[PDB]
Short mmCIF file of all heavy atoms in Angstrom, two decimals:
data_model
loop_
_atom_site.label_atom_id
_atom_site.label_comp_id
_atom_site.label_asym_id
_atom_site.label_seq_id
_atom_site.Cartn_x
_atom_site.Cartn_y
_atom_site.Cartn_z
N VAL C 90 69.38 -142.75 -33.43
CA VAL C 90 68.58 -143.22 -32.30
C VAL C 90 67.63 -142.11 -31.80
O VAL C 90 66.43 -142.35 -31.68
CB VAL C 90 69.47 -143.74 -31.17
CG1 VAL C 90 68.65 -143.99 -29.89
CG2 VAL C 90 70.15 -145.01 -31.63
N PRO C 91 68.15 -140.89 -31.51
CA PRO C 91 67.23 -139.89 -30.95
C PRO C 91 66.18 -139.38 -31.92
O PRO C 91 65.12 -138.97 -31.46
CB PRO C 91 68.15 -138.75 -30.47
CG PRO C 91 69.43 -139.00 -31.15
CD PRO C 91 69.56 -140.51 -31.30
N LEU C 92 66.45 -139.41 -33.22
CA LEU C 92 65.42 -139.08 -34.20
C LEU C 92 64.34 -140.16 -34.21
O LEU C 92 63.14 -139.85 -34.17
CB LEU C 92 66.03 -138.89 -35.59
CG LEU C 92 66.80 -137.55 -35.70
CD1 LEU C 92 67.54 -137.50 -37.02
CD2 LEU C 92 65.93 -136.29 -35.51
N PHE C 93 64.72 -141.44 -34.25
CA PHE C 93 63.70 -142.49 -34.19
C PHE C 93 62.91 -142.42 -32.89
O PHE C 93 61.67 -142.53 -32.90
CB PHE C 93 64.34 -143.90 -34.31
CG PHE C 93 64.34 -144.47 -35.70
CD1 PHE C 93 65.55 -144.80 -36.32
CD2 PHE C 93 63.15 -144.70 -36.38
CE1 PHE C 93 65.53 -145.33 -37.61
CE2 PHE C 93 63.15 -145.25 -37.68
CZ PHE C 93 64.34 -145.56 -38.29
N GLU C 94 63.60 -142.23 -31.77
CA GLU C 94 62.88 -142.22 -30.51
C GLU C 94 62.03 -140.96 -30.39
O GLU C 94 60.90 -141.04 -29.89
CB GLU C 94 63.86 -142.36 -29.32
CG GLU C 94 64.47 -143.77 -29.34
CD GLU C 94 65.29 -144.13 -28.12
OE1 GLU C 94 65.53 -143.24 -27.26
OE2 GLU C 94 65.65 -145.33 -27.98
N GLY C 95 62.53 -139.82 -30.88
CA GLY C 95 61.75 -138.60 -30.84
C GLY C 95 60.47 -138.70 -31.66
O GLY C 95 59.42 -138.17 -31.24
N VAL C 96 60.52 -139.37 -32.81
CA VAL C 96 59.32 -139.48 -33.62
C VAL C 96 58.38 -140.56 -33.09
O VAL C 96 57.17 -140.34 -33.00
CB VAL C 96 59.65 -139.75 -35.11
CG1 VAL C 96 58.38 -139.96 -35.92
CG2 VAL C 96 60.46 -138.54 -35.66
N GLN C 97 58.92 -141.72 -32.71
CA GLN C 97 58.04 -142.85 -32.44
C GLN C 97 57.91 -143.27 -30.98
O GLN C 97 56.91 -143.88 -30.63
CB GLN C 97 58.51 -144.08 -33.23
CG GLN C 97 58.36 -143.89 -34.75
CD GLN C 97 58.61 -145.19 -35.53
OE1 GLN C 97 58.15 -146.25 -35.15
NE2 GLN C 97 59.36 -145.08 -36.62
N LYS C 98 58.90 -142.96 -30.17
CA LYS C 98 58.85 -143.41 -28.77
C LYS C 98 58.30 -142.31 -27.89
O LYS C 98 57.27 -142.49 -27.21
CB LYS C 98 60.23 -143.83 -28.27
CG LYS C 98 60.18 -144.35 -26.82
CD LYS C 98 61.56 -144.74 -26.31
CE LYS C 98 61.44 -145.32 -24.89
NZ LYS C 98 62.78 -145.61 -24.32
N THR C 99 58.98 -141.17 -27.86
CA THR C 99 58.48 -140.09 -27.02
C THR C 99 57.50 -139.18 -27.75
O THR C 99 56.73 -138.45 -27.10
CB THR C 99 59.63 -139.22 -26.49
OG1 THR C 99 60.37 -138.70 -27.60
CG2 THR C 99 60.53 -140.04 -25.65
N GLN C 100 57.49 -139.24 -29.08
CA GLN C 100 56.65 -138.37 -29.91
C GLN C 100 56.80 -136.91 -29.50
O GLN C 100 55.84 -136.14 -29.38
CB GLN C 100 55.19 -138.83 -29.86
CG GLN C 100 55.05 -140.26 -30.37
CD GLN C 100 53.61 -140.68 -30.63
OE1 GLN C 100 52.66 -139.95 -30.32
NE2 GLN C 100 53.45 -141.88 -31.17
N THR C 101 58.05 -136.53 -29.34
CA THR C 101 58.43 -135.17 -29.00
C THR C 101 58.92 -134.39 -30.23
O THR C 101 59.24 -133.20 -30.13
CB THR C 101 59.53 -135.16 -27.93
OG1 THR C 101 60.54 -136.12 -28.30
CG2 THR C 101 58.97 -135.54 -26.57
N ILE C 102 59.00 -135.04 -31.38
CA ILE C 102 59.42 -134.36 -32.60
C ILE C 102 58.18 -134.05 -33.40
O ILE C 102 57.57 -134.94 -33.98
CB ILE C 102 60.41 -135.20 -33.44
CG1 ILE C 102 61.72 -135.36 -32.66
CG2 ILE C 102 60.64 -134.53 -34.83
CD1 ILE C 102 62.78 -136.21 -33.36
N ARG C 103 57.81 -132.77 -33.41
CA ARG C 103 56.58 -132.31 -34.04
C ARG C 103 56.83 -131.18 -35.02
O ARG C 103 55.92 -130.73 -35.69
CB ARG C 103 55.58 -131.85 -32.97
CG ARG C 103 55.41 -132.86 -31.85
CD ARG C 103 54.32 -132.47 -30.88
NE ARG C 103 54.40 -133.29 -29.66
CZ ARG C 103 55.07 -132.94 -28.57
NH1 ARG C 103 55.72 -131.78 -28.54
NH2 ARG C 103 55.08 -133.74 -27.50
N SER C 104 58.06 -130.70 -35.08
CA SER C 104 58.40 -129.54 -35.91
C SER C 104 59.86 -129.63 -36.31
O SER C 104 60.62 -130.39 -35.74
CB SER C 104 58.16 -128.23 -35.15
OG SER C 104 59.16 -128.10 -34.15
N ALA C 105 60.24 -128.80 -37.27
CA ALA C 105 61.64 -128.70 -37.67
C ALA C 105 62.49 -128.25 -36.51
O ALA C 105 63.62 -128.71 -36.37
CB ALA C 105 61.81 -127.74 -38.86
N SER C 106 61.96 -127.38 -35.64
CA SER C 106 62.75 -126.95 -34.48
C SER C 106 63.01 -128.14 -33.58
O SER C 106 64.11 -128.27 -33.01
CB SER C 106 62.03 -125.85 -33.72
OG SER C 106 62.77 -125.43 -32.58
N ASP C 107 62.02 -129.02 -33.44
CA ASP C 107 62.24 -130.19 -32.58
C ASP C 107 63.30 -131.13 -33.15
O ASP C 107 64.08 -131.75 -32.40
CB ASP C 107 60.93 -130.98 -32.36
CG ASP C 107 59.85 -130.16 -31.69
OD1 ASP C 107 60.15 -129.17 -30.94
OD2 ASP C 107 58.67 -130.55 -31.89
N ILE C 108 63.36 -131.23 -34.49
CA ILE C 108 64.39 -132.02 -35.12
C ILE C 108 65.75 -131.39 -34.79
O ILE C 108 66.68 -132.09 -34.39
CB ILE C 108 64.19 -132.07 -36.64
CG1 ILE C 108 62.92 -132.85 -36.94
CG2 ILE C 108 65.41 -132.71 -37.32
CD1 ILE C 108 62.56 -132.74 -38.45
N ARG C 109 65.83 -130.07 -34.93
CA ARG C 109 67.07 -129.35 -34.66
C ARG C 109 67.54 -129.59 -33.21
O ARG C 109 68.73 -129.80 -32.96
CB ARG C 109 66.88 -127.87 -34.95
CG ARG C 109 68.06 -126.98 -34.63
CD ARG C 109 67.73 -125.55 -35.09
NE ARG C 109 68.87 -124.65 -34.91
CZ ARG C 109 69.22 -124.12 -33.74
NH1 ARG C 109 68.52 -124.40 -32.64
NH2 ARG C 109 70.27 -123.33 -33.68
N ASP C 110 66.60 -129.59 -32.26
CA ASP C 110 66.94 -129.87 -30.86
C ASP C 110 67.69 -131.20 -30.69
O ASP C 110 68.59 -131.30 -29.83
CB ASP C 110 65.68 -129.89 -30.01
CG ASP C 110 65.05 -128.54 -29.84
OD1 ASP C 110 65.72 -127.51 -30.09
OD2 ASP C 110 63.87 -128.50 -29.40
N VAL C 111 67.33 -132.20 -31.48
CA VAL C 111 68.00 -133.50 -31.36
C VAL C 111 69.47 -133.33 -31.73
O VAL C 111 70.36 -133.85 -31.05
CB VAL C 111 67.33 -134.57 -32.24
CG1 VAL C 111 68.25 -135.83 -32.39
CG2 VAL C 111 65.95 -134.92 -31.67
N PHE C 112 69.72 -132.57 -32.80
CA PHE C 112 71.12 -132.34 -33.19
C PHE C 112 71.91 -131.53 -32.15
O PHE C 112 73.04 -131.85 -31.84
CB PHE C 112 71.20 -131.63 -34.54
CG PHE C 112 70.88 -132.53 -35.71
CD1 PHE C 112 69.58 -132.98 -35.94
CD2 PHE C 112 71.89 -132.91 -36.59
CE1 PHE C 112 69.28 -133.81 -37.07
CE2 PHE C 112 71.61 -133.72 -37.71
CZ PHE C 112 70.30 -134.15 -37.96
N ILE C 113 71.29 -130.47 -31.63
CA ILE C 113 71.91 -129.66 -30.59
C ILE C 113 72.24 -130.52 -29.36
O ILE C 113 73.34 -130.44 -28.83
CB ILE C 113 71.01 -128.47 -30.15
CG1 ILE C 113 70.61 -127.57 -31.32
CG2 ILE C 113 71.67 -127.66 -29.03
CD1 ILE C 113 71.71 -126.81 -31.88
N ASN C 114 71.29 -131.35 -28.94
CA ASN C 114 71.52 -132.20 -27.76
C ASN C 114 72.65 -133.20 -28.03
O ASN C 114 73.40 -133.58 -27.12
CB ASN C 114 70.24 -132.93 -27.39
CG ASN C 114 70.41 -133.77 -26.14
OD1 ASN C 114 70.83 -133.28 -25.10
ND2 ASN C 114 70.15 -135.07 -26.27
N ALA C 115 72.77 -133.62 -29.28
CA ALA C 115 73.81 -134.58 -29.68
C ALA C 115 75.17 -133.90 -29.86
O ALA C 115 76.16 -134.57 -30.17
CB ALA C 115 73.38 -135.30 -30.95
#
Side-chain angles (χ1 to χ4, degrees):
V90 170
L92 286 172
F93 265 120
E94 292 189 352
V96 176
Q97 293 189 44
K98 182 181 183 185
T99 57
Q100 300 192 353
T101 46
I102 294 178
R103 311 186 193 93
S104 72
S106 179
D107 299 334
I108 293 171
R109 176 175 185 282
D110 291 342
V111 165
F112 286 71
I113 304 291
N114 182 54

